[PDB]
Amino acid sequence: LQVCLPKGPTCCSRKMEEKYQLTARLNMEQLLQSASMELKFLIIQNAAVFQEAFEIVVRHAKNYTNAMFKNNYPSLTPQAFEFVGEFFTDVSLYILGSDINVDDMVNELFDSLFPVIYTQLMNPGLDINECLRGARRDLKVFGNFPKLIMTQVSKSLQVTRIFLQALNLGIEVINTTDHLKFSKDCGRMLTRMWYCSYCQGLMMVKPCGGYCNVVMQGCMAGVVEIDKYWREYILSLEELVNDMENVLLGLFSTIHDSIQYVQKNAGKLTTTIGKLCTLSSRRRELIQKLKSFISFYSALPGYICSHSPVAENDTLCWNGQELVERYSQEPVVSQIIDKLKHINQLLRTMS
């Protein structure tokens, strides 16, 4: 044989030994799944919930701005509907990780807003439109409203996007956990601990607790090293939580004040242009339930040994090759570590 150390006779051949190895692999994967399932489901739930909540906030802000335009500036519709939809679509896209520039969003928004104001509010009575678009930026007609809006929305949308990315990366690492393949020697040790006692003709003998401890510390060598980075990830996320909704809601008030500011100088603007041309409760509850899993990678070998048939008394147990009366005594992991380092640096530099 090549796994079960044959002290004398044996009831199993090499094929039954490969069978025991495959069953050991399946049992280890099932145990890791049972250990990680609750945290995995928690992070998947929260990711879905916060994404839906943010989409609801974006939609609410969208037709709030639409309603304010419809009620206060009916002459600017339906063009206002079009560029407000464009702006909030780009906002949702930037929230979902797309390569979108916030300053460019605000600039395109105001470049679309100014010509309809000039043609429908200041000079009631199309092809010179680009000249008006230029006059929007060359005369700074909106004053300091554009830079204010740029900073206000950029801060909140960036922190929200980084929050969603952190949630997805947590999902990714916890889902990689239960799929971790171990070395051949670790597999042979698991086969010796769980099934090689049957090859010797034993029926109810369980492996020693200390033997399980040494086998699991040998197997989970690199996996325990993930504990520091996982703890720092949890702490950085808690630091980041301690908002995107308030900014997107006050957007309509700021846009209305900007339109009034523009209209206050129409006298000279028309002349010079004619001459020239529960969410916070959900984050808090998520953080409180997540802090309970800060020791997930440190208590994982303990979980594997405590949720498997073991002789914790270390009396009449299987040491891997014989029945004793007293026991005597990376690449994928590196990728998880690198991803954790990246997300931790992002969370640190944010707040």
């Binding site: 339906p78 063009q79 509907f81 079009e82 939809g85």
Partner: protein
């Protein structure tokens, strides 16, 4: 059986301008729209005899 003369062509919304869908058939007494699996409300339909 009813033979369609003007079959609806895939429309595209541009700059929030609502574009209606055309449907013409003969011989026809009732023409209804089934948008995304379900019937469209009677009020939305505008019939021409």
């Amino acid at each position: 059986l009813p033979h369609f003369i003007e079959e609806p062509e895939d429309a595209y919304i541009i700059k929030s301008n609502p574009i209606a869908l055309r449907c013409k058939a003969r011989p026809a007494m009732q023409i209804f729209f089934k948008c995304n699996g379900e019937w469209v409300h009677q009020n939305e339909h505008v019939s021409e005899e």
